[PDB]
Design a protein around this ligand. Sequence first.
Ligand code: CAC
Ligand code: ZN
Ligand code: ZN
Ligand code: ZN
Ligand code: ZN
Ligand code: ZN
Ligand code: ZN
Length: 162
Amino acid sequence: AEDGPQKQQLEMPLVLDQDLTQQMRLRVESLKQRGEKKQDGEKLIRPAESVYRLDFIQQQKLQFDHWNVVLDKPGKVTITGTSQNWTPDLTNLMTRQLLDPAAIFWRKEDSDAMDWNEADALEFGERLSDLAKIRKVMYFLITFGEGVEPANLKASVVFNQL
Ligand SMILES: C[As](C)(=O)[O-]
Ligand SMILES: [Zn+2]
Ligand SMILES: [Zn+2]
Ligand SMILES: [Zn+2]
Ligand SMILES: [Zn+2]
Ligand SMILES: [Zn+2]
Ligand SMILES: [Zn+2]
């Protein structure tokens, strides 16, 4: 097999999850207004982070091909996946539930080309095929650097269908 254009591929977008993001925002706020301490080991959402969602329209016979992360303005974004054991409806995200490594993408000033941490972005992507088997939905925390917001970002993952 030689890698080529005629391969069945599926592109699955990472969609902003407003209500989960809002739920997490509220959580940090409540903790302040009440002067309460966060849970032992909890991950509190920083204002620059937003929760994204990826719905595996197919879970079996998937092979990670590449990331399709694009910024329409110079900037930087970090995409950190979360454990497939974290069910947002049930618990507050734990720091240990953040997957290592994260995929970091950036666009420098006068160039239009994106660049990223190739080795880690690949390692992370390879994991998605197995994570899809655990459940149809997966959550991510996308950290936006200075100058960029969710509106500037278009992220998706491309899998070759086996
Ligand atoms: C925490 As929700 C209501 O985005 O499944
Ligand atoms: Zn070859
Ligand atoms: Zn939601
Ligand atoms: Zn839910
Ligand atoms: Zn590079
Ligand atoms: Zn590099
Ligand atoms: Zn690394």
